[PDB]
Amino acid sequence: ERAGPVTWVMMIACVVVFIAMQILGDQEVMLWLAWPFDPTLKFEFWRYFTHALMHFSLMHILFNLLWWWYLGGAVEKRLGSGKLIVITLISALLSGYVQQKFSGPWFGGLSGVVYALMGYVWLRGERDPQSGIYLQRGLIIFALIWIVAGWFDLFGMSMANGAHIAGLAVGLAMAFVDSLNA
């Protein structure tokens, strides 16, 4: 009982990327991994996802990865690799899209995906506890605090509020759908 392959690879990739940003600077890394910021870039398709891999401070990566580890790891063990992969891909594109829409292509990090995972895990537990999946009371509280910090901009998280809701909404939709089975 550890962190599965999707859980573990993402963490590794985010770390390696953060190191690359510490050495080359953020800008050089953004140049390569950010949402297409020019028409000439619109068919470099990794860019619609690789923005989620870049973090700008230690707070930012530390907390995103704690949540990812705990929640993404829970989803992966109890529900499967494919599920985590899908939640991640969809929440990444959507939050990316909204961010980009309201504020330009210069952003990054896994917090959109974390809002999806928070909404997914909380609502699956609410609607379908027998899945094995739920957010603990204590943790609802820490989640909520983490959300507040970002909503009221008490700590720098790269992405804006409309993008985090997009992320949340995706996680809610998917839990909804998933719990619609039984």
mmCIF file of C-alpha atoms in Angstrom:
data_model
loop_
_atom_site.group_PDB
_atom_site.id
_atom_site.type_symbol
_atom_site.label_atom_id
_atom_site.label_comp_id
_atom_site.label_asym_id
_atom_site.label_seq_id
_atom_site.Cartn_x
_atom_site.Cartn_y
_atom_site.Cartn_z
ATOM 1 C CA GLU A 1 0.000 0.000 0.000
ATOM 2 C CA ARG A 2 1.904 3.016 -1.437
ATOM 3 C CA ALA A 3 1.326 5.578 -4.275
ATOM 4 C CA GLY A 4 0.428 3.991 -7.658
ATOM 5 C CA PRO A 5 2.058 4.690 -11.019
ATOM 6 C CA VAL A 6 -0.075 7.682 -12.103
ATOM 7 C CA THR A 7 0.182 9.238 -8.661
ATOM 8 C CA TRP A 8 3.934 8.671 -8.525
ATOM 9 C CA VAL A 9 4.778 9.716 -12.098
ATOM 10 C CA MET A 10 2.982 13.005 -11.879
ATOM 11 C CA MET A 11 4.852 13.846 -8.659
ATOM 12 C CA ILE A 12 8.153 12.994 -10.236
ATOM 13 C CA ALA A 13 7.392 15.003 -13.344
ATOM 14 C CA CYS A 14 6.338 18.060 -11.304
ATOM 15 C CA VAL A 15 9.557 17.865 -9.265
ATOM 16 C CA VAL A 16 11.832 17.454 -12.280
ATOM 17 C CA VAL A 17 10.096 20.388 -13.858
ATOM 18 C CA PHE A 18 10.376 22.531 -10.760
ATOM 19 C CA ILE A 19 14.137 21.737 -10.688
ATOM 20 C CA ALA A 20 14.411 22.652 -14.378
ATOM 21 C CA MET A 21 12.748 25.949 -13.469
ATOM 22 C CA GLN A 22 15.148 26.566 -10.591
ATOM 23 C CA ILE A 23 18.119 26.068 -12.927
ATOM 24 C CA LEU A 24 16.895 27.691 -16.222
ATOM 25 C CA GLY A 25 14.450 30.057 -14.662
ATOM 26 C CA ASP A 26 10.684 29.961 -14.907
ATOM 27 C CA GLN A 27 10.539 31.786 -18.247
ATOM 28 C CA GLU A 28 12.696 29.498 -20.182
ATOM 29 C CA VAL A 29 10.596 26.574 -18.912
ATOM 30 C CA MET A 30 7.311 28.359 -19.653
ATOM 31 C CA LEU A 31 8.537 29.047 -23.143
ATOM 32 C CA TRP A 32 8.452 25.275 -23.680
ATOM 33 C CA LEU A 33 5.580 24.037 -21.421
ATOM 34 C CA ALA A 34 3.001 26.787 -21.200
ATOM 35 C CA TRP A 35 -0.405 27.064 -22.877
ATOM 36 C CA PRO A 36 0.071 28.195 -26.546
ATOM 37 C CA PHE A 37 0.904 31.865 -26.186
ATOM 38 C CA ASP A 38 1.257 32.408 -29.930
ATOM 39 C CA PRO A 39 -0.617 31.093 -33.063
ATOM 40 C CA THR A 40 2.641 29.459 -34.155
ATOM 41 C CA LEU A 41 2.307 27.252 -31.058
ATOM 42 C CA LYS A 42 -1.308 26.202 -31.335
ATOM 43 C CA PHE A 43 -0.485 22.706 -32.672
ATOM 44 C CA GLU A 44 2.051 21.856 -29.983
ATOM 45 C CA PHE A 45 -0.489 19.732 -28.248
ATOM 46 C CA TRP A 46 1.415 18.856 -25.065
ATOM 47 C CA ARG A 47 0.927 22.581 -24.094
ATOM 48 C CA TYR A 48 -2.772 22.199 -23.472
ATOM 49 C CA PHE A 49 -1.645 19.862 -20.520
ATOM 50 C CA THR A 50 2.008 20.595 -19.563
ATOM 51 C CA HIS A 51 1.082 23.901 -17.902
ATOM 52 C CA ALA A 52 -0.101 21.716 -14.931
ATOM 53 C CA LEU A 53 3.479 20.573 -14.330
ATOM 54 C CA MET A 54 5.021 23.965 -13.503
ATOM 55 C CA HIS A 55 5.117 25.429 -10.038
ATOM 56 C CA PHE A 56 6.462 28.915 -9.017
ATOM 57 C CA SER A 57 7.167 28.558 -5.321
ATOM 58 C CA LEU A 58 7.884 25.959 -2.769
ATOM 59 C CA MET A 59 4.507 26.543 -0.985
ATOM 60 C CA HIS A 60 2.736 26.015 -4.287
ATOM 61 C CA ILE A 61 4.324 22.672 -5.264
ATOM 62 C CA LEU A 62 4.439 21.363 -1.668
ATOM 63 C CA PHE A 63 0.750 21.806 -1.017
ATOM 64 C CA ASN A 64 -0.430 20.770 -4.499
ATOM 65 C CA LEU A 65 1.511 17.546 -4.244
ATOM 66 C CA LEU A 66 0.324 16.765 -0.682
ATOM 67 C CA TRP A 67 -3.240 16.929 -1.875
ATOM 68 C CA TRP A 68 -2.408 15.077 -5.100
ATOM 69 C CA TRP A 69 -0.640 12.339 -3.152
ATOM 70 C CA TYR A 70 -3.432 11.935 -0.689
ATOM 71 C CA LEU A 71 -6.487 12.346 -2.931
ATOM 72 C CA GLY A 72 -5.110 11.279 -6.290
ATOM 73 C CA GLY A 73 -3.467 8.354 -4.519
ATOM 74 C CA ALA A 74 -6.783 7.384 -2.876
ATOM 75 C CA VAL A 75 -8.638 7.524 -6.182
ATOM 76 C CA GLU A 76 -5.931 5.458 -7.849
ATOM 77 C CA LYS A 77 -5.869 2.672 -5.282
ATOM 78 C CA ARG A 78 -9.599 2.356 -4.678
ATOM 79 C CA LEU A 79 -10.981 3.279 -8.146
ATOM 80 C CA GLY A 80 -8.178 2.860 -10.628
ATOM 81 C CA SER A 81 -5.399 4.436 -12.707
ATOM 82 C CA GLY A 82 -7.709 5.204 -15.642
ATOM 83 C CA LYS A 83 -10.068 7.216 -13.478
ATOM 84 C CA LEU A 84 -7.285 9.393 -12.100
ATOM 85 C CA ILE A 85 -5.870 9.870 -15.599
ATOM 86 C CA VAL A 86 -9.249 11.074 -16.889
ATOM 87 C CA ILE A 87 -10.049 13.370 -13.979
ATOM 88 C CA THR A 88 -6.591 14.882 -14.406
ATOM 89 C CA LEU A 89 -6.702 15.362 -18.156
ATOM 90 C CA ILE A 90 -10.147 16.955 -18.152
ATOM 91 C CA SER A 91 -9.581 19.210 -15.103
ATOM 92 C CA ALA A 92 -6.219 20.297 -16.510
ATOM 93 C CA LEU A 93 -7.638 21.336 -19.916
ATOM 94 C CA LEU A 94 -10.712 23.047 -18.563
ATOM 95 C CA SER A 95 -9.036 25.066 -15.771
ATOM 96 C CA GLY A 96 -6.254 25.809 -18.257
ATOM 97 C CA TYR A 97 -8.813 27.094 -20.710
ATOM 98 C CA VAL A 98 -10.652 29.361 -18.328
ATOM 99 C CA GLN A 99 -7.476 30.717 -16.786
ATOM 100 C CA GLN A 100 -6.158 31.432 -20.252
ATOM 101 C CA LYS A 101 -9.435 33.023 -21.283
ATOM 102 C CA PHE A 102 -9.630 35.517 -18.417
ATOM 103 C CA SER A 103 -5.837 36.113 -17.843
ATOM 104 C CA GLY A 104 -3.466 35.079 -20.626
ATOM 105 C CA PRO A 105 -1.369 31.983 -21.172
ATOM 106 C CA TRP A 106 1.249 32.633 -18.456
ATOM 107 C CA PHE A 107 0.184 30.351 -15.576
ATOM 108 C CA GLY A 108 0.821 26.888 -14.204
ATOM 109 C CA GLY A 109 0.443 24.170 -11.634
ATOM 110 C CA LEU A 110 -1.716 21.308 -10.466
ATOM 111 C CA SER A 111 -4.263 23.299 -8.355
ATOM 112 C CA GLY A 112 -7.035 23.031 -10.976
ATOM 113 C CA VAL A 113 -6.589 19.300 -10.834
ATOM 114 C CA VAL A 114 -6.582 19.430 -6.984
ATOM 115 C CA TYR A 115 -9.966 21.285 -6.931
ATOM 116 C CA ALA A 116 -11.298 18.516 -9.225
ATOM 117 C CA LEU A 117 -9.975 15.857 -6.859
ATOM 118 C CA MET A 118 -11.422 17.639 -3.761
ATOM 119 C CA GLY A 119 -14.868 17.987 -5.340
ATOM 120 C CA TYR A 120 -14.742 14.421 -6.698
ATOM 121 C CA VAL A 121 -13.691 12.719 -3.441
ATOM 122 C CA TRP A 122 -16.013 14.777 -1.259
ATOM 123 C CA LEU A 123 -19.109 14.179 -3.376
ATOM 124 C CA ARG A 124 -18.417 10.505 -4.009
ATOM 125 C CA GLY A 125 -18.329 10.062 -0.258
ATOM 126 C CA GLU A 126 -21.485 12.056 0.262
ATOM 127 C CA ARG A 127 -23.419 10.152 -2.444
ATOM 128 C CA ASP A 128 -21.812 6.734 -2.332
ATOM 129 C CA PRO A 129 -19.759 6.045 0.831
ATOM 130 C CA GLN A 130 -19.540 2.320 -0.116
ATOM 131 C CA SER A 131 -17.124 3.255 -2.957
ATOM 132 C CA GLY A 132 -14.473 3.449 -0.209
ATOM 133 C CA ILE A 133 -13.999 7.097 -1.140
ATOM 134 C CA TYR A 134 -14.784 10.121 1.036
ATOM 135 C CA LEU A 135 -13.145 13.303 2.478
ATOM 136 C CA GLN A 136 -12.663 13.070 6.304
ATOM 137 C CA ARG A 137 -14.132 15.859 8.450
ATOM 138 C CA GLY A 138 -10.768 17.064 9.603
ATOM 139 C CA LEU A 139 -9.626 17.193 6.011
ATOM 140 C CA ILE A 140 -12.664 18.911 4.707
ATOM 141 C CA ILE A 141 -11.541 21.635 7.041
ATOM 142 C CA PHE A 142 -8.015 21.762 5.766
ATOM 143 C CA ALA A 143 -9.229 21.616 2.194
ATOM 144 C CA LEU A 144 -11.567 24.553 2.918
ATOM 145 C CA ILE A 145 -8.784 26.596 4.454
ATOM 146 C CA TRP A 146 -6.600 25.853 1.367
ATOM 147 C CA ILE A 147 -9.446 27.015 -0.879
ATOM 148 C CA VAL A 148 -9.912 30.213 1.116
ATOM 149 C CA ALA A 149 -6.238 31.067 0.946
ATOM 150 C CA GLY A 150 -6.414 30.941 -2.811
ATOM 151 C CA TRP A 151 -9.883 32.534 -3.240
ATOM 152 C CA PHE A 152 -8.871 35.600 -1.195
ATOM 153 C CA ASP A 153 -5.327 35.523 -2.517
ATOM 154 C CA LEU A 154 -3.716 34.997 0.926
ATOM 155 C CA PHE A 155 -1.174 32.744 -0.814
ATOM 156 C CA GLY A 156 0.088 32.829 -4.469
ATOM 157 C CA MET A 157 -1.285 29.820 -6.432
ATOM 158 C CA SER A 158 -0.770 30.962 -10.054
ATOM 159 C CA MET A 159 -4.430 30.232 -11.108
ATOM 160 C CA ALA A 160 -7.460 32.453 -10.541
ATOM 161 C CA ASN A 161 -10.778 31.590 -8.996
ATOM 162 C CA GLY A 162 -12.831 31.031 -12.131
ATOM 163 C CA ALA A 163 -10.199 28.441 -13.218
ATOM 164 C CA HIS A 164 -10.402 26.620 -9.833
ATOM 165 C CA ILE A 165 -14.196 26.408 -9.980
ATOM 166 C CA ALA A 166 -13.908 24.975 -13.534
ATOM 167 C CA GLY A 167 -11.665 22.416 -11.925
ATOM 168 C CA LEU A 168 -14.030 21.882 -9.027
ATOM 169 C CA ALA A 169 -17.008 21.563 -11.350
ATOM 170 C CA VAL A 170 -15.367 18.814 -13.356
ATOM 171 C CA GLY A 171 -14.628 16.818 -10.217
ATOM 172 C CA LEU A 172 -18.244 17.359 -9.065
ATOM 173 C CA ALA A 173 -19.634 16.267 -12.447
ATOM 174 C CA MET A 174 -17.611 13.124 -12.534
ATOM 175 C CA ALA A 175 -18.452 12.106 -8.914
ATOM 176 C CA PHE A 176 -22.055 12.840 -9.782
ATOM 177 C CA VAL A 177 -21.977 10.664 -12.853
ATOM 178 C CA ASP A 178 -19.984 7.931 -11.040
ATOM 179 C CA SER A 179 -22.467 7.776 -8.150
ATOM 180 C CA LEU A 180 -25.407 7.706 -10.564
ATOM 181 C CA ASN A 181 -24.504 3.985 -11.256
ATOM 182 C CA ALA A 182 -25.894 2.211 -8.219
#
